[PDB]
Amino acid sequence: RLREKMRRRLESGDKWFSLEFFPPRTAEGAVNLISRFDRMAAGGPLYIDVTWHPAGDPGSDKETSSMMIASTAVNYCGLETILHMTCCRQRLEEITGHLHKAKQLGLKNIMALRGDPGFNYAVDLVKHIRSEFGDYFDICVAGYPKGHPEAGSFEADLKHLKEKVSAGADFIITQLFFEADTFFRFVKACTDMGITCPIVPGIFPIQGYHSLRQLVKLSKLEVPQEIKDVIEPIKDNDAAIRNYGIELAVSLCQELLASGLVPGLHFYTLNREMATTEVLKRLGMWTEEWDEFPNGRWGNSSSPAFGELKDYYLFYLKSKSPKEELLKMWGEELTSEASVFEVFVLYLSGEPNRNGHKVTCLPWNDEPLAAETSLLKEELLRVNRQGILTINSQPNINGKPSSDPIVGWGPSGGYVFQKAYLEFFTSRETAEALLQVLKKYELRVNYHLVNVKGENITNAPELQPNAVTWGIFPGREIIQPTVVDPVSFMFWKDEAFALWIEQWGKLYEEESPSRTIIQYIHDNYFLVNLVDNDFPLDNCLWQVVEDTLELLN
Amino acid sequence: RLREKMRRRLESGDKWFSLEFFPPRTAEGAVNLISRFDRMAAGGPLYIDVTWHPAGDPGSDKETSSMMIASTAVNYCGLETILHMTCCRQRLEEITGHLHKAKQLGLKNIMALRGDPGFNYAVDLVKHIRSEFGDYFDICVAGYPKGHPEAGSFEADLKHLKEKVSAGADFIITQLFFEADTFFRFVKACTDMGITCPIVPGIFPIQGYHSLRQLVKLSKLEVPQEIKDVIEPIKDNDAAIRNYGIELAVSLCQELLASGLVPGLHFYTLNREMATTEVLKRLGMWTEEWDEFPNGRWGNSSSPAFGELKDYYLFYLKSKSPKEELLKMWGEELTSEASVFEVFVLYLSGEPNRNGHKVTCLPWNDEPLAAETSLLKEELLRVNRQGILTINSQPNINGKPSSDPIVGWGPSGGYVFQKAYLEFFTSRETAEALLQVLKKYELRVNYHLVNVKGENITNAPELQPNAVTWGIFPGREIIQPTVVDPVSFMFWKDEAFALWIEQWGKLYEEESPSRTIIQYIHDNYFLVNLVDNDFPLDNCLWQVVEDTLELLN
């Protein structure tokens, strides 16, 4: 049993580590994840666990399902695997079937959580598993060193934690923390209540700017000033960020293990090994494609680490974004699609709406408009004003020092290149006119068009990813941060279209004309993605759009 | 047994195919080869065979040894594996030990060859294996549809083939041919003699320009005019070459299998699957990193297909290069290293030697000096004249259409880039002066220096390959044809240094002063490799060399 070995390790004074992975968005991602499992197992982790993300039908039977990732790890790889579980908006028989399948599939360890929106708290699930399936499953539960964000207080949260662990459970996994002192405080507090189950500290290695930028938003974590200050100059050079994160992790882990109150370190891998492996090797616990820079939904899809961090349970919708402010931003009600066009335009121009409220966000892009779109702002306003609703773009760039404050990245002393591209929704009429016009730009312009119905039109290769950003650096291969890939793009459509009726539509009633307008847009508008391959020349995307309008109008 | 299944396939009218691989030069090459084996096995090849190359100690115990490649294929992969064998300059007990090990290792099939320079002909080996190891091993033998190059005639060669197959053997593998008619002629001729063992036709898919260029040299094969003519315009665009080769292979194989006299097709893979897989899928026999463009010793070392084609047994030293002409070219005798410098200079300038003979070749570079060195000829003459003996180089190039007749390659409508680099030998004194001078070019210049003793000095990353040539093409990832890699470079030194005393030294007697000069050079001269990373600027390699000379002189 897991608890048994953990106690037969604690009593011997052995220190162990564990690794947390999340189901890859894509099948070849699953294959690469399994390869990662095999390679990391040589370190001798006590157990791995697979995150349970409610959004992506976790209890399904596809090769992406967390269930099957865990099942493959435990059967084929032999690694101890804990399957996470959530309760929010789940019915009794669904949970029952899931646990039955897990029993059949051999998921001997179930990690019980509550998730986020016949079960309300995590205590209810632990109690369901203990009542029905007996003591087959080993149950651990989440603990929070500073207090769950929405708890009334840290003391009542500790009381509820006691209640949970007393019902069932076997050990507590503790959310990431930046200083060992707080974890010691938490351990002592639990000790006073007499929580006998071991508490395992969560270690989050900062790996690239994206992780930091997401993490800083989480208020209660209170990222120390030092980390932000040091990173900020380095911000562009992710590799340096990773090194600093490794240094921080080693320091924190050394301080923890110095005390001996820590049975073992729980590392959130984010499906990226090198960082965690280096940290473990520095501590010395390591027993003994290289895609480690996901670049959100743009980088290599086949990478197991592919995926926007905001989809990770830790940063899933924490940016509350109150619905009343969204309603006041994008207009209380819409008279016609012209209103939608206006909203898209203001998001880029920045002038206040007629009601005086600036449109600060859109359903798709949450992050602030980067400083590269200053080179496209006028043309973007042009296209958006004329019904071409851009949701992403970048200018074509020739060789430029990697130290350029606007467009530079990567190891200093390199040269960085970009291909112009344009992601935008359009009316079916505009889409067809765009298809006709492109015929004369076929050689130099790559385009993907897809409807919510799934109909897809593309001239790019069926499965070859079109490289769009790359850099030349001394003594190193060619880095390709940004990619346009039909596979990543094709399923991305489902998210992009869903956002129309999920984030914007819900703001309006079911019979309101605004809802009808949004539904019309969601049903008919195409999703389009254009790339200009002639990067050493002037950006023709403006010209092709202009001739599309001239043909249509 | 292999013969058994082949006959139980022939009698049923089943058609089968086989795949031939060669031991990769590098360990990760072996791993990738094993992956290729696993993936190709889904086609259901009857048997694979592993080439036996005498040069690279084939009967060794490293992970590159053909023996162990075969052993891993048969044990771990389960694929029927034939181990090739050679006789030239091998002793009785070495062969005996090799076969004993094979028996222990489970290499149930031994392919008996003669190789090239107590055994003289392949008949002696087949007879040794049949005498000592009984009928455990299944023996096939090479046959030649047009006649072995050095045979007296095709009829006496056929008689000797009969003799060989009568002693032992079980089937004949036939060297590549371009037209099925000749194979039919060979089959009929053998039939008249009553060769009862099945004859398996060798299929060579042309995959890239390098293969064609090597193959055309082999006279007896007599490459049809059509292939050369069609390829020549395409020559630069390898992918198109591969497509044409696939078409040719499909046509030839269809014509063969139409007759029914062919039990099965034997494909020389060259450790590259896509081409062979496509051909098989076209025929329909397929049961059901992507590095497929080796670029000789420059491309990705980890690729199983890495390696100069001239090392392949088929094109191993066929370019006789008579020793008397080498002696008359590079000087009958040498008075000092100045003579070597003169030879190196003339190789690039092209003026006739004082004796009137033009220096057409050097031990290292056999291929004619490409048309890109016209952009460096004056500086190359400078450096060579001043004791910097270049054996490779390329100019730094910014964006240039891929259709450029001089430097273009790859899919049309791309942009091609190059980093300047310089491979050259130097005196130890010049080497140290170069090391001192480089300190001020450390940021932009990457350098590797290594001696025959193995001492190595480098500022590049320990194992990261420095990319030196790349191209930007529509709707495609960044292609990296040419790489500078410490791993490939580090063992390459052994070949480069060995050539000094093997190809040049042997021309002079053991006590001759010329031999002493060549030995001095081979012992003391460093092997150097410089790369200029600032490709959008003027080539500084000339400047750094000039300041190296200024410091020294």
Ligand SMILES: Cc1cc2nc3c(=O)[nH]c(=O)nc-3n(C[C@H](O)[C@H](O)[C@H](O)COP(=O)(O)OP(=O)(O)OC[C@H]3O[C@@H](n4cnc5c(N)ncnc54)[C@H](O)[C@@H]3O)c2cc1C
């Ligand atoms: C290691 C770890 C892994 C995680 N994995 C995932 C994952 O895979 N998927 C995912 O969606 N989320 C995951 N989370 C996040 C977690 O699911 C959310 O924080 C969730 O909202 C809280 O679940 P819980 O287990 O704390 O349940 P609970 O403790 O029941 O809920 C937390 C809140 O409920 C309160 N509470 C608990 N019991 C009572 C009670 N009896 N009366 C009143 N209030 C009570 C607590 O005070 C606290 O405010 C993970 C968190 C951690 C630390």
Ligand SMILES: Cc1cc2nc3c(=O)[nH]c(=O)nc-3n(C[C@H](O)[C@H](O)[C@H](O)COP(=O)(O)OP(=O)(O)OC[C@H]3O[C@@H](n4cnc5c(N)ncnc54)[C@H](O)[C@@H]3O)c2cc1C
């Ligand atoms: C399918 C295939 C695979 C190969 N694999 C390899 C490999 O892994 N490594 C490698 O180094 N080479 C390889 N070769 C090349 C081969 O080893 C060379 O061509 C070699 O020089 C000839 O060997 P052989 O088997 O024909 O032996 P032999 O037939 O003994 O030698 C060929 C020559 O000997 C003559 N000869 C044969 N018997 C007699 C006799 N009794 N009296 C007089 N003359 C005789 C023939 O007429 C012919 O001219 C391969 C060739 C083929 C077709």
Ligand SMILES: C[S@@+](CC[C@H](N)C(=O)[O-])C[C@H]1O[C@@H](n2cnc3c(N)ncnc32)[C@H](O)[C@@H]1O
């Ligand atoms: C992931 S980036 C694409 C650029 C690419 N990653 C690179 O290496 O430069 C997202 C970019 O899309 C641009 N852009 C984002 N949202 C846009 C919108 N609604 N309309 C027009 N342009 C937008 C922003 O400049 C933002 O920096």
Ligand SMILES: C[S@@+](CC[C@H](N)C(=O)[O-])C[C@H]1O[C@@H](n2cnc3c(N)ncnc32)[C@H](O)[C@@H]1O
């Ligand atoms: C999104 S791009 C550049 C975006 C935009 N052009 C800018 O600089 O503001 C930067 C990406 O390059 C990738 N990157 C990849 N390898 C890197 C490396 N060795 N060093 C630094 N960044 C790297 C990371 O995914 C990283 O997110």
Ligand SMILES: C[S@@+](CC[C@H](N)C(=O)[O-])C[C@H]1O[C@@H](n2cnc3c(N)ncnc32)[C@H](O)[C@@H]1O
């Ligand atoms: C494999 S290429 C290197 C260029 C690279 N492959 C590219 O993509 O352009 C070999 C080149 O080395 C150059 N060069 C070769 N031998 C040389 C020699 N002895 N001295 C100076 N330059 C040489 C020739 O131009 C030849 O084309």
Ligand SMILES: C[S@@+](CC[C@H](N)C(=O)[O-])C[C@H]1O[C@@H](n2cnc3c(N)ncnc32)[C@H](O)[C@@H]1O
């Ligand atoms: C050696 S380089 C260019 C040499 C030199 N610059 C010239 O053009 O004469 C060409 C290499 O690019 C690689 N190449 C790789 N991928 C290719 C592709 N899709 N199409 C064409 N060539 C490719 C091949 O290894 C091929 O040998």
